[PDB]
């Protein structure tokens, strides 16, 4: 997936959503819909939905 980093902490509230902490290394697999990306964690051991505005792509 495409290299990115988490901008803010993200508290899920749902089993479909992936918890983030500010500064986490992640990889974006695809866009699920308006406002939602499917992401994997640094090692690829976990995957889930995160807000589109809570990540930035690594240049």
Q: What is the structure's resolution, reported in angstroms to one decimal? A: 1.7
Q: Which is nearest to 20 in space by CA: 1, 7, 3?
A: 7
Partner residues linked to 6 by β-bridges: 55
Task: Please tell me the distance from the alpha carbon of residue 6 to that of residue 45, in angstroms, as a whole number.
Answer: 17
Measured CA angle at 12 (ends 8, 17), to 5 deg: 100
User: SS3 of 51, please?
Assistant: strand
The experimental method, as deposited, was: X-ray
- What whole-number distance in Å separates Cα of residue 41 and Cα of residue 20? 9
| Cα 36 to the center of its chain, rounded Å | 9
| Torsions phi, psi for 54 (to 5 deg) | -100, 0
Measure the N-to-C terminal CA separation of the chain; round to a whole number of Å: 14
Domain 1-59, CATH homologous superfamily name and number: SH3 Domains (2.30.30.40)
């Amino acid at each position: 997936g495409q290299r990115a980093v988490a901008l803010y902490d993200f508290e899920p509230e749902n089993d479909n959503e992936l918890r983030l902490a500010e500064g986490d290394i992640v990889f974006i697999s695809y866009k699920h819909g308006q406002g939602w990306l499917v992401a994997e964690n640094e090692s690829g051991s976990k995957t889930g939905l995160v807000p589109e505005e809570f990540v930035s792509y690594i240049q």
